[PDB]
């Protein structure tokens, strides 16, 4: 076992309603950044999903192990920023500033005080993690009770993004996406390319799907407004400003009012209920930017 070779295990997109509690545990899906956390001698070290050393990017998490000073542990979990409803928000994480509070929500334990746990079944790793957290300041969200449909319904009532089901008998497989973990969201989600923006900072974004002849306008998506989402989103949009509309049809007057067009370089993810027959996203909401996705990969899902 070696923390410096570790990469997170990944979940397969699927449906959790139908899965039974006898074989499956159910966790809330937390929007944030995935972190592997090594705590030793009261000091913390961090690895991102890409294996990069990101310890310096999270000074908020330095105190994580000050309560664990006698332990040597490796944890898996999510760094999160909570919205005003208490729910992890990806956009608030992406737009965090120097005063923004960041938490680490742990959901796995991969090494504990001389015992490497990759081959230990999830159900047993969880009990060890819960015991560790009950005695310290580590934050370990509880499992959702019931079978998959009940767990999904509970997640929805809380306003959480979805559920991750994890097989109770499953080992931890670093760096692999596995059938033993199933991820399921309440909302349909669609990748879109940003073609322009309107002020309230940045009040809203004009979305499109790449096609022959340019972006096919998919509607305006409100940002929700952090008044820092906007200063930061403006920052990412500023190098892309252009006088040339990227859309395949010049935008209608109401959608073009006050618009700054951008080169169609940035992918974002939005939630939606259904497509309209004209190609617009109904009940859209902003999840956040997807900086590693390429516009050429964006297709109507």
Ligand X SMILES: Nc1ncnc2c1ncn2[C@@H]1O[C@H](COP(=O)(O)OP(=O)(O)OP(=O)(O)O)[C@@H](O)[C@H]1O
Q: Which tokens go with 116?
A: 């490497």
Encoded one letter per residue, x for contact with ligand X by CB under 6 A and - for no contact, window 74-93 reads: ----x---------------
Give the residue, chosen from 6, 16, 19, 29, that forms a contact with ligand X under the rule CB under 6 A.
Answer: 29
Only one of the segments 28-36, 168-176, 207-215, 241-249 lies at the binding site for ligand X (rule: CB under 6 A); that segment is 28-36
Contact predicate 204/198, CB 8 Å: yes
| Minimum distance from residue 95 beta carbon to ligand X (Å) | 17
Q: Name which of 105 and 261 has its Cβ closer to ligand X.
A: 105
| Minimum distance from residue 45 beta carbon to ligand X (Å) | 20
Only one of the segments 23-31, 96-104, 115-123, 147-155 lies at the binding site for ligand X (rule: CB under 6 A); that segment is 23-31
Only one of the segments 27-35, 63-71, 79-87, 246-254 lies at the binding site for ligand X (rule: CB under 6 A); that segment is 27-35
Give the residue, chosen from 10, 21, 154, 236, that forms a contact with ligand X under the rule CB under 6 A.
Answer: 10
Give the residue, chosen from 6, 19, 24, 27, that forms a contact with ligand X under the rule CB under 6 A.
Answer: 27
Q: Tell me the three-class secondary structure of 283-297, residue by residue.
A: CCEEEEECCCCCHHH
Q: Name which of 106 and 262 has its Cβ closer to ligand X.
A: 106
Q: According to the binding rule CB under 6 A, does residue 164 interact with ligand X?
A: yes
Q: According to the binding rule CB under 6 A, does residue 183 interact with ligand X?
A: yes
| Minimum distance from residue 166 beta carbon to ligand X (Å) | 7
Say how many C-beta atoms besides its own lie within 10 A of residue 292's C-beta. 7
CA atoms within a 13 Å half-sphere pointing along the CA-CB vector of 191 = 17
Rg from Cα positions in the chain: 21
| Minimum distance from residue 105 beta carbon to ligand X (Å) | 8
Give the residue, chosen from 107, 111, 172, 286, that forms a contact with ligand X under the rule CB under 6 A.
Answer: 107
Rounded to whole angstroms, the maximal C-alpha distance in the chain is: 65
Q: Name which of 29 and 132 has its Cβ closer to ligand X.
A: 29
Q: Name which of 191 and 261 has its Cβ closer to ligand X.
A: 191
Give the residue, chosen from 34, 47, 125, 167, that forms a contact with ligand X under the rule CB under 6 A.
Answer: 34
Query: Which positions ≥6 away from 135 have C-beta within 8 Å?
Result: none
Q: According to the binding rule CB under 6 A, does residue 11 interact with ligand X?
A: yes
| Minimum distance from residue 144 beta carbon to ligand X (Å) | 10
| Minimum distance from residue 225 beta carbon to ligand X (Å) | 22
Binding residues for ligand X (CB under 6 A) = 10-11, 27, 29-30, 34, 78, 107, 164, 183
């Amino acid at each position: 076992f070696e923390f410096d070779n570790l990469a997170p295990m990944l979940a397969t997109h699927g449906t959790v309603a139908g899965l039974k509690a006898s074989q499956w545990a159910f966790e809330g899906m937390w929007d944030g950044y995935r972190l592997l956390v090594e705590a030793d001698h009261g000091a913390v070290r961090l690895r991102s999903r890409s294996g990069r050393d990101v310890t310096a990017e999270y000074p908020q998490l330095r105190a994580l192990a000050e309560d664990l000073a006698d332990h040597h542990v490796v944890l898996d979990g999510e760094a999160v920023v909570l919205d005003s409803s208490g729910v992890p928000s990806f956009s608030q994480m992406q737009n965090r500033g120097r005063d923004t509070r960041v938490e680490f929500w742990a959901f796995d334990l991969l090494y504990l005080d001389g015992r490497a746990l990759l081959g230990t079944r999830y159900q047993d790793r969880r009990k060890l993690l819960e015991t560790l957290a009950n005695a310290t300041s580590l934050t370990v969200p509880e499992l959702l009770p019931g079978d998959g449909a009940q767990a999904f319904a509970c997640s929805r009532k809380h306003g959480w993004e979805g559920v991750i089901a994890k097989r109770r008998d499953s080992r931890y497989q670093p760096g692999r996406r596995c059938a033993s973990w199933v991820k399921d969201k309440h909302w349909n989600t669609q990748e879109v390319v940003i073609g322009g923006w309107r002020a309230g900072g940045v009040g809203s974004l004009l979305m499109g799907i790449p096609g022959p002849g340019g972006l096919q306008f998919a509607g305006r998506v409100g940002t929700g407004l952090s008044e820092r989402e906007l200063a930061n989103l403006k920052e990412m949009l500023a190098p892309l400003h252009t006088d040339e509309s990227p859309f395949d049809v010049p935008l209608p007057a109401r959608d073009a009012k006050g618009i700054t067009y951008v080169k169609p370089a940035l992918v974002a993810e939005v939630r939606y209920s259904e497509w309209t027959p004209e190609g617009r996203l109904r009940q859209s909401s902003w999840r956040g930017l997807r900086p590693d996705k390429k516009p050429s990969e964006v297709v109507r899902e």
